[PDB]
Amino acid sequence: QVQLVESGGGLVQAGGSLRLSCAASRRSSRSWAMHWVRQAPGKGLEWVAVISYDGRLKYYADSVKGRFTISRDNYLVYLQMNSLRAEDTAVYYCAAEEGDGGFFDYWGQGTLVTVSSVLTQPPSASGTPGQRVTISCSGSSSNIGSNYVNWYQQLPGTAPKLLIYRNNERPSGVPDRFSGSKSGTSASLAISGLRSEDEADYYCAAWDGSLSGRGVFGTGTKLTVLE
Ligand SMILES: [K+]
Ligand SMILES: [K+]
């Protein structure tokens, strides 16, 4: 298993610059791309940029275009952040994408950047142990209507994990209690037999076929279990 380690975070004044590093423990022919995903404290996930294994493909979110630059060096991937703003304050993760599975197949630990001065989901959901809970994801023709859906689970203070890829497929280690589906421009995550460990945030995800710099992540759903 490849291990990813982010570094470079710290305190910076607005307008300043900072370079983050994503280090991979070893090369892998399965991993073809490396993403950066950030999360402001208490907010949702936001995809930042991606670079292919050979550096020839690079894409950025519109919220960082022109200010951020992704690059790599032979086992390191760099994110050069210029003209930093308070909105850029977030934990920055890097995540590799393999030739199968989902957009973000494994993740690092995160590095915090502090700058000193659309897929809609229900904000919250709940259930009792053993209950069946469904989480909706409402998109458009350009994203869900045109591309596969992913689902990601995030426990408090930890990096998210891939739950569902290719609309309805589970990676290894995901129980069959989780299932996904997609119809038209909407998608849904279903959790049968809700367990206490399922209390987490859940994000749907789908790439946009028109203007891909818009965003990939859903708004996120906080699921609480009433014991
Ligand atoms: K590689
Ligand atoms: K993948």
Q: Residue ranges per domain, the chain?
A: 4-116, 124-225
Q: What is the resolution of this structure in A?
A: 2.2
Taking CA atoms, 227 is separated from 126, 192, 195, 196, in Å, by: 11, 16, 9, 7
How many whole angstroms from its chain centre is CA 110? 12
User: What separation in Å is there between the alpha carbon of 121 and the centre of ligand 2?
Assistant: 23
Q: Which amino acid is it at 32?
A: W
> What method was applied to determine this entry?
X-ray
Nearest ligand by distance to the CA of 205: 2
Q: Are 5 and 23 contacting, i.e. CB atoms less than 8 angstroms apart? A: yes
Nearest ligand by distance to the CA of 103: 2
User: What separation in Å is there between the alpha carbon of 226 and the centre of ligand 1?
Assistant: 43
Pairing outcome for strands 45-52 and 150-154 = unpaired
Q: Which overall architecture, per CATH, does domain 4-116 show? A: Sandwich (2.60)
User: What separation in Å is there between the alpha carbon of 174 and the centre of ligand 1?
Assistant: 25
Token couple for 21 = 């590093």
At 222, which helix (H) or strand (E)?
A: strand 221-225
Sign of CA dihedral 65, 144, 191, 131: positive
Nearest ligand by distance to the CA of 28: 1
Q: How far apart are CA 150 and CA 155, in angstroms?
A: 17
User: What separation in Å is there between the alpha carbon of 102 and the centre of ligand 2?
Assistant: 4
Q: Residue-wise over 160-178: b if at least 16 C-beta within 10 A, else e?
A: bbbbbbebbebeeebeeeb
Report which DSSP code applies to 198: G
Q: How many C-alpha atoms does 44 have within 13 Å on its Cβ side?
A: 22
Same fold, 4-116 and 124-225: yes
Name residue, tokens 């991937």: 77
User: What separation in Å is there between the alpha carbon of 81 and the centre of ligand 1?
Assistant: 24
Q: How far apart are CA 112 and CA 91, in angstroms?
A: 4
Nearest ligand by distance to the CA of 30: 1
- What does the angle CA 84 – CA 85 – CA 89 come to, to the nearest 5 degrees? 95
User: What separation in Å is there between the alpha carbon of 161 and the centre of ligand 2?
Assistant: 12
Q: Which amino acid is it at 208?
A: D
User: What separation in Å is there between the alpha carbon of 138 and the centre of ligand 1?
Assistant: 33
User: What separation in Å is there between the alpha carbon of 165 and the centre of ligand 2?
Assistant: 8
Q: How far apart are CA 159 and CA 140, in angstroms?
A: 27
Q: CATH topology for 124-225?
A: Immunoglobulin-like (2.60.40)
